[PDB]
Structures are given as structure tokens and as C-alpha cells.
Amino acid sequence: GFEFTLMVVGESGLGKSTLINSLFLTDLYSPEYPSHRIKKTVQVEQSKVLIKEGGVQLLLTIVDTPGFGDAVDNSNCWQPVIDYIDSKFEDYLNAESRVNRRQMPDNRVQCCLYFIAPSGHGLKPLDIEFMKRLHEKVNIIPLIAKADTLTPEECQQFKKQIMKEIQEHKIKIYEFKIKDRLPLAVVGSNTIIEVNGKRVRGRQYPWGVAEVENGEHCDFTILRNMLIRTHMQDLKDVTNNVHYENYRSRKLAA
């Protein structure tokens, strides 16, 4: 087998559930059921996705954070995400410090997808604060959400502006060309529609169909391929040898 812990962060309604379902071919999320307005906070939610393909089975933990960025006042909304991540480091540090450390559960967060709203301008203040405060605790993959809302020229200018701001703020996102088109701009959909004679997943508008697996429409295929067993391993290795060790060295030095 093989295990992996993926965290999802972003405002409500940025296509996060649809993208997760699109990457892993799941139907993991329930509809919004009724009944209005009670102040929102970031709540950590875990799903276990056990995907069996005949022996090569993947055990995937999806850590969602509904409420992030959704209140009128989003002050310190990163803090519950820090608390969850750092608590997993602490659990690991305590487990490996035991005299009899045979068992060893590993729940450290190995990747964080951060969804950027496709405004077409730049990063929001909350985007900068979240990434600047988490980039040394977890592997951040920033994503331009709902990328079918950008024309190609708008998308290109928006990618460039975002990368300009990540550099200006000395933000260290996860690094593996693919770097030429960061951040990845994704479209998600499990809806099948026939475009020409081929059935493909994508989003049906009156004027045409944005295709999830068309590399000229979005970077979904790049992202899915980046999240397979071999590239998951490097995400695990950096979590362990960089983020965990940095946390461990900091706590022990005190």
C-alpha cells in the first residue's frame, strides 16, 4: 500500500470539492443543506479515501478546512490550520521520542492545495497572509481556481502577477517546463459531455465546453500527474526532512 495526507484550503465556492472529486474520481462531498448566518470559523474535517486498484491501493487522507476566508472578519483564520499541522509534528516528535517506539503513526500534512480566486488582478491580502505564515510548515501548491473564468491573456497576466507577489513577499511554495506556467490554473468537473465524437469531462456553457483534461484549457492534467505515487514521495520527503525537522529543531533547542 501507500499513504498520503492532502490538505485543502480556500474560500467557499472556489471549486475545491469538485477538483478533489476530479483528481481521484470520487463523489466525496454532500450538498449544502439548510438556516442562515451563524458566524463562521475554520473547522478541520478529515476524510479517508481508500482507492483499491487490485493491490496497488492508496490510502488518502483529505484534510478540509471549511470556513477559511468566509467570515466578515477573517483575522487569524490561518491559526487553526497552523494548529492542526503543528500538532501532527508534535505527535510525531513525541512518538519517535518514546523508549518503545514500534508503532509510529504518521499523520503529518504532506501537501496543501491553496485555491486562489480568479479575480484577474493579483493575490488578495488573505492569500499573502496564509502562504507567508504556512510556507515553512507545509508544502503549499497554490492553484488558480475556476480557471475557465479567465481568457488566456487574462490568465497569463494573472499567473505572472501572482508569481511576482510570491517573490516580493519571499514566499516559498513547493517546487518540483512546469515551473514556466505557475501557479497551476485548474478546472474541475465530473460531468461527461460529448464534444465532437469524444466523451470528455468538462463544463457545458451555451457557447462551448471547458474541458478538464485539455491542456490548452487548464492545467488539471499537470496537477493530477504531479499527485501520483512517485511525486507524492518527494512531497512526503520534504515534509519529513525539512518541515518536520525544522519544527523539531526549534522545539528541542528551547
The CB-based long-range contact list for 130-135 (8 Å cut-off, 24+ gap) reads 130/9, 130/77, 130/78, 130/81, 131/166, 131/169, 131/171, 131/173, 132/169, 132/170, 132/171, 133/78, 133/82, 134/78, 134/81, 134/82, 134/85, 135/171, 135/172, 135/173
215 touches its own copies (CB under 8 A): no
17 touches Mg ion (CB under 5 A): yes
- Please choose, out of 10-18, 39-47, 76-84, 218-226, the segment that lies near Mg ion by the rule CB under 5 A: 10-18
12 touches ligand GDP (CB under 6 A): yes
**After which residues is the chain discontinuous, taking C to N > 2.5 Å?**
34, 176
Give the residue with the Cβ less far from ligand GDP, 13 or 215: 13
* 53 assigned ligand-binding residue: no
Pairing mode of beta strands 192-195, 184-185: unpaired
User: By C-alpha distance, which of 85, 43, 40, 222 is closest to 147?
Assistant: 222
- Chosen residue from 1, 25, 39, 54 binding its own copies by CB under 8 A: 39
- Please choose, out of 20-28, 91-99, 114-122, 236-244, the segment that lies near its own copies by the rule CB under 8 A: 114-122
198 touches its own copies (CB under 8 A): no
Residues 144 to 203 in contact with ligand GDP, rule: CB under 6 A: 146, 148-149, 154, 187-188, 203
Residues 6+ apart with CB under 8 A from 17: 28, 29
Residue 125 contacts which entry, Mg ion, its own copies, ligand GDP, none (Cβ below 5-8 A, type-dependent): its own copies
Q: How far apart are the two ends of the chain, measured CA to CA in Å?
A: 38
75 touches its own copies (CB under 8 A): yes
Residues 6+ apart with CB under 8 A from 92: 106, 107, 108, 244
Give the C-alpha separation, 117 to 13, whole Å. 9
Residue 202, strand partner residues: 211
- Chosen residue from 27, 32, 53, 194 binding its own copies by CB under 8 A: 32
- Please choose, out of 6-14, 49-57, 95-103, 132-140, the segment that lies near ligand GDP by the rule CB under 6 A: 6-14
104 within 8 A of 93, measured Cβ to Cβ: no
Residue 248 contacts which entry, its own copies, ligand GDP, Mg ion, none (Cβ below 5-8 A, type-dependent): none
- Chosen residue from 2, 12, 45, 231 binding its own copies by CB under 8 A: 12
Residue 65 contacts which entry, ligand GDP, its own copies, Mg ion, none (Cβ below 5-8 A, type-dependent): none
5 touches Mg ion (CB under 5 A): no
36 touches its own copies (CB under 8 A): yes
Which residues contact Mg ion by CB under 5 A?
17
Annotated binding site: 10-17, 41, 67, 146-154, 188, 203
